[PDB]
Write an enzyme that holds these catalytic residues in place. Sequence first.
Site, PDB file in Angstrom:
ATOM      1  N   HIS A 112       0.831  -1.212   0.000  1.00 33.64           N
ATOM      2  CA  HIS A 112       0.000   0.000   0.000  1.00 33.64           C
ATOM      3  C   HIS A 112       0.867   1.264   0.000  1.00 33.64           C
ATOM      4  CE1 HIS A 112      -3.308  -2.696   0.895  1.00 33.64           C
ATOM      5  NE2 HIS A 112      -2.750  -3.053   2.035  1.00 33.64           N
TER       6      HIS A 112
ATOM      7  N   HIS B 186       5.731   6.944   6.571  1.00 33.89           N
ATOM      8  CA  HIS B 186       5.471   6.536   5.203  1.00 33.89           C
ATOM      9  C   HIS B 186       4.967   7.733   4.429  1.00 33.89           C
ATOM     10  CE1 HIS B 186       1.596   6.231   7.252  1.00 33.89           C
ATOM     11  NE2 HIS B 186       1.114   6.653   6.089  1.00 33.89           N
TER      12      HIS B 186
ATOM     13  N   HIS C 244       3.681  11.016   6.402  1.00 35.69           N
ATOM     14  CA  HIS C 244       3.035  10.762   7.678  1.00 35.69           C
ATOM     15  C   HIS C 244       3.999  10.110   8.640  1.00 35.69           C
ATOM     16  CE1 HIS C 244      -1.105  10.544   5.536  1.00 35.69           C
ATOM     17  NE2 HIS C 244      -0.696  11.786   5.769  1.00 35.69           N
TER      18      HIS C 244
ATOM     19  N   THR D 268      -6.107   6.920   7.503  1.00 35.32           N
ATOM     20  CA  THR D 268      -6.601   7.174   6.155  1.00 35.32           C
ATOM     21  C   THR D 268      -6.608   5.929   5.276  1.00 35.32           C
ATOM     22  OG1 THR D 268      -4.458   7.655   5.226  1.00 35.32           O
ATOM     23  CG2 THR D 268      -5.650   9.496   6.265  1.00 35.32           C
TER      24      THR D 268
ATOM     25  N   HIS E  92       2.311   9.058   0.932  1.00 31.63           N
ATOM     26  CA  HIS E  92       1.298   8.844  -0.097  1.00 31.63           C
ATOM     27  C   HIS E  92       1.665   9.756  -1.252  1.00 31.63           C
ATOM     28  CE1 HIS E  92      -1.415   6.940   2.933  1.00 31.63           C
ATOM     29  NE2 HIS E  92      -0.719   7.733   3.732  1.00 31.63           N
TER      30      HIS E  92
ATOM     31  N   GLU F 299      -3.044  13.558   0.648  1.00 34.08           N
ATOM     32  CA  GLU F 299      -4.337  13.147   1.215  1.00 34.08           C
ATOM     33  C   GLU F 299      -5.080  14.361   1.743  1.00 34.08           C
ATOM     34  OE1 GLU F 299      -4.271   8.685   1.912  1.00 34.08           O
ATOM     35  OE2 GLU F 299      -3.393   9.569   3.679  1.00 34.08           O
TER      36      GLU F 299
HETATM   37  C1  LIG Z   1      -1.667  -5.588   8.580  1.00 34.85           C
HETATM   38  O1  LIG Z   1      -2.018  -4.984   9.775  1.00 34.85           O
HETATM   39  C2  LIG Z   1      -1.333  -4.016  10.193  1.00 34.85           C
HETATM   40  O2  LIG Z   1      -0.344  -3.622   9.518  1.00 34.85           O
HETATM   41  C3  LIG Z   1      -1.664  -3.374  11.497  1.00 34.85           C
HETATM   42  N1  LIG Z   1      -0.467  -2.778  12.003  1.00 34.85           N
HETATM   43  C4  LIG Z   1      -0.159  -1.462  11.596  1.00 34.85           C
HETATM   44  N2  LIG Z   1       1.107  -0.918  11.900  1.00 34.85           N
HETATM   45  C5  LIG Z   1       1.376   0.305  11.543  1.00 34.85           C
HETATM   46 CL1  LIG Z   1       2.918   0.922  11.880  1.00 34.85          CL
HETATM   47  N3  LIG Z   1       0.419   1.120  10.887  1.00 34.85           N
HETATM   48  C6  LIG Z   1      -0.720   0.572  10.616  1.00 34.85           C
HETATM   49  N4  LIG Z   1      -1.774   1.244  10.018  1.00 34.85           N
HETATM   50  C7  LIG Z   1      -1.754   2.585   9.627  1.00 34.85           C
HETATM   51  C8  LIG Z   1      -0.908   3.603  10.246  1.00 34.85           C
HETATM   52  C9  LIG Z   1      -1.028   4.881   9.816  1.00 34.85           C
HETATM   53  C10 LIG Z   1      -1.999   5.233   8.748  1.00 34.85           C
HETATM   54  S1  LIG Z   1      -2.163   6.914   8.221  1.00 34.85           S
HETATM   55  N5  LIG Z   1      -2.098   6.883   6.639  1.00 34.85           N
HETATM   56  O3  LIG Z   1      -3.456   7.354   8.707  1.00 34.85           O
HETATM   57  O4  LIG Z   1      -1.003   7.581   8.806  1.00 34.85           O
HETATM   58  C11 LIG Z   1      -2.770   4.249   8.197  1.00 34.85           C
HETATM   59  C12 LIG Z   1      -2.637   2.880   8.653  1.00 34.85           C
HETATM   60  N6  LIG Z   1      -1.052  -0.751  10.990  1.00 34.85           N
HETATM   61 ZN   LIG Z   2      -0.563   7.711   5.769  1.00 28.45          ZN
END
Ligand SMILES: COC(=O)CNc1nc(Cl)nc(Nc2ccc(S(N)(=O)=O)cc2)n1
Ligand SMILES: [Zn+2]
Length: 257
Positions: free
Chosen positions: A61, A91, A116, A195, A93, A103
């Site tokens: 993603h 990360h 982000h 997001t 986008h 975003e």
């Molecule tokens: C597969 O499941 C997972 O990865 C859940 N574990 C996990 N670990 C992190 Cl470091 N971020 C995330 N999700 C996530 C973090 C930040 C964002 S954002 N784009 O709102 O900043 C969107 C999604 N999930």
């Molecule tokens: Zn993000």
Amino acid sequence: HWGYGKHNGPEHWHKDFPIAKGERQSPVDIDTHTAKYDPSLKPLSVSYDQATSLRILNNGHAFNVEFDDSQDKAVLKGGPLDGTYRLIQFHFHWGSLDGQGSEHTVDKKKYAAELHLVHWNTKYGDFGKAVQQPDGLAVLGIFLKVGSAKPGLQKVVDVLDSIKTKGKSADFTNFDPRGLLPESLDYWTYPGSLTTPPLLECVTWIVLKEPISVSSEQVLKFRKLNFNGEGEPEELMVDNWRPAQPLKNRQIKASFK
Ligand SMILES: COC(=O)CNc1nc(Cl)nc(Nc2ccc(S(N)(=O)=O)cc2)n1
Ligand SMILES: [Zn+2]
């Protein structure tokens, strides 16, 4: 199964994740004239001097630069925040074209990309518990525009060839995220969500007013990544952004006049 394509993109997410149509979803358009200065908002405190980066991962993603978050080594405090939030990853986008990719938008303007820096509230012990809380996360958002190169981004750009496809990771130690910050820490803030799925409403958004500049070559290298796994048909990782969502019953506050 969710992604950014025609058949699995943001307009489809609500079927698996009904909170997609919730009351505090992100991103949003920041209407600069309607945001209200809050003179009581404290300066942000970004303390990244002891940051320990570990690894970079293409997760299908975006790509995450991951940090050791088992101690208070790189933390965000102050601003709208109560307590201490630990940096877990950053990360980006980005778009297929320089005219889109962010975003958040600013008076409907889209930037070429958005960084982000994701932090979780230490009072909840770990990230998984934090995302279940309304004040669990603080994400620091920074816009990217195309112009001069950002020297501090280059080490990230140059490892991307080694994580081209979904599920690939590479060692990524000794990276200093301070090199990705603009000069000013003036910001807007509002309560929102992740997001991407699961779209949990757990984020205090802090979006910096000043963009960073990156070079055309730098963003071109983002666009060579793949959403697909190795050996699968090539699908360029581009346009991995969710568009602006309804503000609903929220006020965006500004740290500056
Ligand atoms: C597969 O499941 C997972 O990865 C859940 N574990 C996990 N670990 C992190 Cl470091 N971020 C995330 N999700 C996530 C973090 C930040 C964002 S954002 N784009 O709102 O900043 C969107 C999604 N999930
Ligand atoms: Zn993000």
